[PDB]
């Protein structure tokens, strides 16, 4: 059905779409939870309140497709058991960094 998303290969494309993300922390932070696979090459949020166009949905950054799939496990709830909503870790189908 489906074994793993991105692969593996330097810095190029392959970050991934985190859904369900409330603001409940900043975007610089998800930095600090990650510091440990790679140096993540950007990190974002959208909200979809005003455009109807996401779904609440944040964009964590994960070039290197090897990388990603850290964010696959590292980074799936990115936040210490006790809720803080976690995100559904997944490299999207655009590729954009």
Avoid: W
């Amino acid at each position: 059905m489906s074994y793993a998303r991105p692969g593996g290969e330097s810095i190029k494309d392959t970050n991934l779409y985190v859904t369900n993300l409330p603001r409940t922390i900043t975007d610089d932070q998800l930095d600090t939870i990650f510091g440990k696979y790679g140096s993540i090459v950007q990190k974002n949020i959208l909200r979809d309140k005003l455009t109807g166009r996401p779904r609440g949905v944040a964009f964590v950054r994960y070039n290197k497709r090897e990388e990603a799939q850290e964010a696959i496990s590292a980074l799936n709830n990115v936040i210490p058991e006790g809720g803080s909503q976690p995100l559904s870790v997944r490299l999207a189908e655009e590729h954009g960094k």
